[PDB]
Design an enzyme around this catalytic site. Structure first.
Site, PDB file in Angstrom:
ATOM      1  N   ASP A   1      -2.288  -5.985   4.407  1.00  0.00           N
ATOM      2  CA  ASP A   1      -1.744  -5.595   3.060  1.00  0.00           C
ATOM      3  C   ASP A   1      -2.998  -6.483   2.197  1.00  0.00           C
ATOM      4  O   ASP A   1      -2.527  -7.542   2.071  1.00  0.00           O
ATOM      5  CB  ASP A   1      -0.455  -6.315   3.202  1.00  0.00           C
ATOM      6  CG  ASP A   1       0.080  -5.211   1.776  1.00  0.00           C
ATOM      7  OD1 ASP A   1      -0.574  -4.665   0.769  1.00  0.00           O
ATOM      8  OD2 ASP A   1       1.268  -6.064   1.177  1.00  0.00           O
TER       9      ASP A   1
ATOM     10  N   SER B   1     -11.620   3.738 -11.122  1.00  0.00           N
ATOM     11  CA  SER B   1     -12.419   4.930 -10.641  1.00  0.00           C
ATOM     12  C   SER B   1     -12.799   5.895 -12.090  1.00  0.00           C
ATOM     13  O   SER B   1     -12.239   5.607 -13.105  1.00  0.00           O
ATOM     14  CB  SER B   1     -11.168   5.755 -10.240  1.00  0.00           C
ATOM     15  OG  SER B   1     -11.356   6.899  -9.658  1.00  0.00           O
TER      16      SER B   1
HETATM   17  N1  LIG Z   1       1.202  -3.478  -1.244  1.00  0.00           N
HETATM   18  C1  LIG Z   1       1.930  -4.637  -1.790  1.00  0.00           C
HETATM   19  C2  LIG Z   1       2.128  -4.601  -3.526  1.00  0.00           C
HETATM   20  C3  LIG Z   1       3.381  -3.838  -3.709  1.00  0.00           C
HETATM   21  C4  LIG Z   1       3.619  -3.314  -5.103  1.00  0.00           C
HETATM   22  C5  LIG Z   1       2.799  -3.386  -5.992  1.00  0.00           C
HETATM   23  C6  LIG Z   1       3.048  -3.032  -7.035  1.00  0.00           C
HETATM   24  F1  LIG Z   1       3.187  -1.241  -7.072  1.00  0.00           F
HETATM   25  F2  LIG Z   1       3.458  -3.778  -7.995  1.00  0.00           F
HETATM   26  F3  LIG Z   1       1.802  -2.677  -7.523  1.00  0.00           F
HETATM   27  C7  LIG Z   1       1.749  -3.820  -5.262  1.00  0.00           C
HETATM   28  C8  LIG Z   1       0.868  -4.117  -4.247  1.00  0.00           C
HETATM   29  N1  LIG Z   2       3.586  -2.833  -0.112  1.00  0.00           N
HETATM   30  C1  LIG Z   2       3.984  -3.701   1.434  1.00  0.00           C
HETATM   31  C2  LIG Z   2       4.444  -3.289   2.103  1.00  0.00           C
HETATM   32  C3  LIG Z   2       4.500  -3.174   3.477  1.00  0.00           C
HETATM   33  C4  LIG Z   2       5.161  -2.566   4.311  1.00  0.00           C
HETATM   34  C5  LIG Z   2       6.800  -2.408   3.326  1.00  0.00           C
HETATM   35  C6  LIG Z   2       7.999  -1.762   4.850  1.00  0.00           C
HETATM   36  F1  LIG Z   2       7.731  -0.056   4.820  1.00  0.00           F
HETATM   37  F2  LIG Z   2       7.752  -2.010   6.089  1.00  0.00           F
HETATM   38  F3  LIG Z   2       8.619  -1.983   4.532  1.00  0.00           F
HETATM   39  C7  LIG Z   2       7.081  -2.650   2.762  1.00  0.00           C
HETATM   40  C8  LIG Z   2       6.016  -3.317   1.703  1.00  0.00           C
END
Ligand SMILES: NCc1ccc(C(F)(F)F)cc1
Ligand SMILES: NCc1ccc(C(F)(F)F)cc1
Length: 330
Positions: A35, A199
Site C-alpha cells: 500500500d 497529472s
Molecule cells: N491506501 C491508503 C489510503 C487510504 C485513504 C486515502 C485517502 F482517502 F485519505 F486519500 C489515501 C490512502
Molecule cells: N487503502 C488501504 C486499504 C486496503 C485494503 C482494504 C480492505 F479492502 F482490505 F478492507 C482497506 C483499506
C-alpha cells in the site's frame, strides 16, 4: 542488494493485490497488501481477537526467535474507506523476495474492522508511503522501504500490476525489459506524506486531450480511480445509459456497454487505460447494472490514482533525496 516478488490479484476483479512476505525466524509467510498510500506494516496475529479472524494466516511472535516486543508502543490506523485496525508493536526480521531488513517494526493487530475480517485473502498491509504517516506511538517507526533504502542498489521500488494476471514488485533496480519506450519522471510532493504528483490532463476515448492540472496520489492500496467531478462526468457522458446512483454509491453503467479508454498525462507523455480496465462487474449477483472503475473524488477530498490507473503502466517510486515518480507504458 535487490528484491523481487510476484503480486497476485485476490479475485476476478483485481480488487486488491497480495504479495508474499517472510516474517520472523523461522520464516512465517504472510500475504500482504502493498500500500503506497499508508505507512504501517501490520498483520493479523495470535493476538487478534479470535472472532475477528476468518481464514487469515496469523503471525505468531512467540514462535519467532528474532521477535522483540517494543515496550509500550501502540498503533491505531483509520483508512479513507472507513477501515481501521490497532494493536501493539514487535520488531522482527522481514524479507521480501530475497531482500531482508532486520529490526523492522511489525505491528500486531489486536482489533480489526469488519472489512478486513471478511477479506480472508489479505493477511495484512505493507505500507510504502513516507514514514511521517506511520501511526506508532509514542515512537514513530520507519517503513520497510525506508529501512532497506541504504542497502538497496538504487533507492527505488517499482510497481508492475497485472490486469487479471500476476505482476511484480521490485526493490532496488529498474527492470528495463518490463516496459516499452521511455520512463517519464515527474515531481513528487511529500508534504502530506503521500506519493503526491500532478497529472497534466486527460482524454476520453479518442477525444481531444484536455490540458489541466490534476493533483493526486499514486496509491497501490486503492482499487479505483478517483478524479474530480468534472472529469468523471465527462467520461461517463460517453457511455450510453451510465448514471450516478446514490443508492449504489457512484457511477453505474449497463453491463452490455463497451467502455471507452481513459488517458491521463504525465508531463508530455500519455498513459492509456483500456476501457476493459474500468469495468468492475455487476453491482449485485445477476444484475445487469455494472459498477464503474472511475469515480468522483468530491467526497474524498483528494484525487487518487489507484490500481485502475497504475496497472496500465510501469511505475517507478524513486525514493532519492528529492523523490520522483516515473511512468512508462507497457
Ligand atoms: N491506501 C491508503 C489510503 C487510504 C485513504 C486515502 C485517502 F482517502 F485519505 F486519500 C489515501 C490512502
Ligand atoms: N487503502 C488501504 C486499504 C486496503 C485494503 C482494504 C480492505 F479492502 F482490505 F478492507 C482497506 C483499506
Amino acid at each position: 542488494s535487490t528484491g523481487s516478488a510476484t503480486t497476485t490479484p485476490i479475485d476476478s476483479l483485481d480488487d486488491a493485490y497480495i504479495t508474499p512476505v517472510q516474517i520472523g525466524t523461522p520464516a512465517q509467510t504472510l500475504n500482504l497488501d502493498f500500500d503506497t498510500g499508508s505507512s504501517d506494516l501490520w498483520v493479523f496475529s495470535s493476538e487478534t481477537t479470535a472472532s475477528e479472524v476468518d481464514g487469515q494466516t496469523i503471525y505468531t511472535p512467540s514462535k519467532s526467535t528474532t521477535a522483540k516486543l517494543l515496550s509500550g508502543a501502540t498503533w491505531s490506523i483509520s483508512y479513507g474507506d472507513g477501515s481501521s485496525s490497532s494493536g501493539d508493536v514487535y520488531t522482527d526480521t522481514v524479507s521480501v523476495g530475497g531482500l531482508t531488513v532486520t529490526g523492522q517494526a511489525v505491528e500486531s493487530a489486536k482489533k480489526v474492522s469488519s472489512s478486513f475480517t471478511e477479506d480472508s485473502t489479505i493477511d495484512g498491509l505493507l505500507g510504502l508511503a513516507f514514514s511521517t504517516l506511520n501511526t506508532v506511538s509514542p515512537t514513530q517507526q520507519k517503513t520497510f522501504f525506508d529501512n532497506a533504502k541504504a542497502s538497496l542498489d538504487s533507492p527505488v521500488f517499482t510497481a508492475d500490476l497485472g490486469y487479471h494476471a500476476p505482476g511484480t514488485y521490485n526493490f532496488g533496480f529498474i527492470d528495463t525489459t518490463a516496459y516499452t519506450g521511455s520512463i517519464t519522471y515527474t515531481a513528487v510532493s511529500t508534504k502530506q506524506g503521500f506519493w503526491e504528483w500532478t497529472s497534466t490532463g486527460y482524454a476520453v476515448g479518442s477525444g481531444t486531450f484536455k490540458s489541466t492540472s490534476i493533483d493526486g496520489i499514486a496509491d497501490t492500496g486503492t482499487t479505483l480511480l478517483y478524479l474530480p467531478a468534472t472529469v468523471v462526468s465527462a467520461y461517463w457522458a460517453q457511455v450510453s445509459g451510465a448514471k450516478s446512483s446514490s443508492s449504489v454509491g457512484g457511477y453505474v453503467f449497463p453491463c452490455s456497454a463497451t467502455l471507452p479508454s481513459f488517458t491521463f498525462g504525465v508531463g508530455s507523455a500519455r498513459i492509456v487505460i483500456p476501457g476493459d480496465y474500468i469495468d468492475f462487474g455487476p453491482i449485485s449477483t445477476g444484475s445487469s447494472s455494472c459498477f464503474g472503475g472511475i469515480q468522483s473524488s468530491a467526497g474524498i477530498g483528494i484525487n487518487i490514482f489507484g490500481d485502475v490507473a497504475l496497472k496500465a503502466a510501469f511505475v517507478v517510486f524513486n525514493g532519492a533525496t528529492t523523490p520522483t515518480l516515473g511512468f512508462a507504458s507497457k
